[PDB]
Design an enzyme around this catalytic site. Sequence first.
Site, mmCIF file in Angstrom:
data_model
loop_
_atom_site.group_PDB
_atom_site.id
_atom_site.type_symbol
_atom_site.label_atom_id
_atom_site.label_comp_id
_atom_site.label_asym_id
_atom_site.label_seq_id
_atom_site.Cartn_x
_atom_site.Cartn_y
_atom_site.Cartn_z
ATOM 1 N N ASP B 9 0.816 -1.214 0.000
ATOM 2 C CA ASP B 9 0.000 0.000 0.000
ATOM 3 C C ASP B 9 0.854 1.270 0.000
ATOM 4 O O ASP B 9 0.823 2.069 0.932
ATOM 5 C CB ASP B 9 -0.966 0.003 1.187
ATOM 6 C CG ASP B 9 -2.044 -1.045 1.058
ATOM 7 O OD1 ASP B 9 -2.412 -1.382 -0.082
ATOM 8 O OD2 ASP B 9 -2.528 -1.533 2.100
ATOM 9 N N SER B 10 1.624 1.445 -1.066
ATOM 10 C CA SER B 10 2.323 2.706 -1.284
ATOM 11 C C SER B 10 2.228 3.089 -2.752
ATOM 12 O O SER B 10 1.711 2.313 -3.557
ATOM 13 C CB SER B 10 3.779 2.610 -0.853
ATOM 14 O OG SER B 10 3.870 2.415 0.540
#
Lengths: 250, 49, 64, 48, 49, 49
Positions: B9-10
């Site tokens: 989740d980046s």
Amino acid sequence: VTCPNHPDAILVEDYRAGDMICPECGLVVGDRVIDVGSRTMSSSDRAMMNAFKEITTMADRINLPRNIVDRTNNLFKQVYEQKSLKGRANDAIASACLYIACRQEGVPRTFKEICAVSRISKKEIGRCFKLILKALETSVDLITTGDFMSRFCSNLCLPKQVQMAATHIARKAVELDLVPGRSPISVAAAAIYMASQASAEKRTQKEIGDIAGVADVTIRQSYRLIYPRAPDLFPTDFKFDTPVDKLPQL
Amino acid sequence: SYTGYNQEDSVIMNRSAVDRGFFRSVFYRSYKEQESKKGFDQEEVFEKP
Amino acid sequence: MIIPVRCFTCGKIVGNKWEAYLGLLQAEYTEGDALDALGLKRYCCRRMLLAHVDLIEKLLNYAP
Amino acid sequence: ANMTFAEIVTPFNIDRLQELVRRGNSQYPGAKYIIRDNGDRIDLRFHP
Amino acid sequence: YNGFTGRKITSQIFIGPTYYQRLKHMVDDKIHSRARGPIQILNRQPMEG
Amino acid sequence: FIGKIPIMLRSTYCLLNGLTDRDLCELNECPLDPGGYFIINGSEKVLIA
Ligand SMILES: [Zn+2]
Ligand SMILES: [Zn+2]
């Protein structure tokens, strides 16, 4: 100021750790010593406590701001503390404190007005007033007509131009002392009357008299005193709705 | 999957698009101060100390 | 609030094409044809004009 | 550049530490206090 | 194509335009540190104030 | 005289009732503002059903 090596000359404090530092040496003489933030039971003033509730009831019935009231609260507290005037009616003192604060704010309200919000006779308020002036040993100020030009003309919903014209008329009249020995309000109301009579927003003296509280004959007399100079008393920036020649007589 | 800097989740984002106004914004904030007469002698006033 | 001067992805100059774009939609052109009459052929430079909301024309209604 | 670590001075690291104390709170790899044997905590930000 | 070496990428990448938003939580607002800071007065416990 | 009641904005008893966008902008108000909240000591309060 002190250090083991020298008597300190200056001790600055710091926002960081929160401590006292001594620049001739950097030594942290202080050590995180400074803080970086740099009813039924009541017997005393059961009546004083209630008086400020009653001050708050009476003072803001006319909706006077809180700053005025706070000094009125401070004034009473002071009058209470001396207690020279302790043997007197509290509500009169509260009302007198109120008259004073308005003057202290440079916006006095008439005793007649102050009477509207209190049971105290104007006489007893005046009497108590004198006693407070003597009690607190402080001077006062003289009244000006223009300070009441605002709300009365407002109460008549008169436009600023009439309002301002009246003020000049009043101002010119007092500078010339056209009405010696008279209260400012009665003279002002007649000026307002004259002004209103110089605009479409004419009103009967009784209505004005009703708003100011003064006698309709007193305006009539005051009018008789200002009427000789009705034309020249008006401001240079004015637009007649009725010629000064056509100004009524009474 | 490009170089491992966008795992779990980046996001990787273009640097020379940020330099042309991408997702730029401003930030306002207000402060109140009120002078007050808390006592009959203790009085505050705005002035240069 | 106001048309950006450069496309965020290419870098092509867009800030001088907003009045001509309104002028072409004024007569009869479809958005697909007005964008071709201006020379925007990559779909990253067409997103610039196709999805722009002009808020500056509503802040000029408040007297200074 | 805000959190610190107290390091005792020994003849093995005297030169490096006095070099660090030459530059204080302005250069990053620096120091911000000297604690001598007496407990005197002097501050490098105010020392002339 | 790869940006560092110019070679092609063996897989084909799914690309297209989408609509992103910028949330309110920025990092300039969440970083803080303490190292021998101010302390309280009564209990002498570390204080922020 | 009895007292004073707060007034919900854009109601039939507000000063903004039935105005046109040329006048809403003249008082420095937004024509898109929905209304339906109180102004109490500067703040803007809303009542939850
Ligand atoms: Zn010293
Ligand atoms: Zn482009």
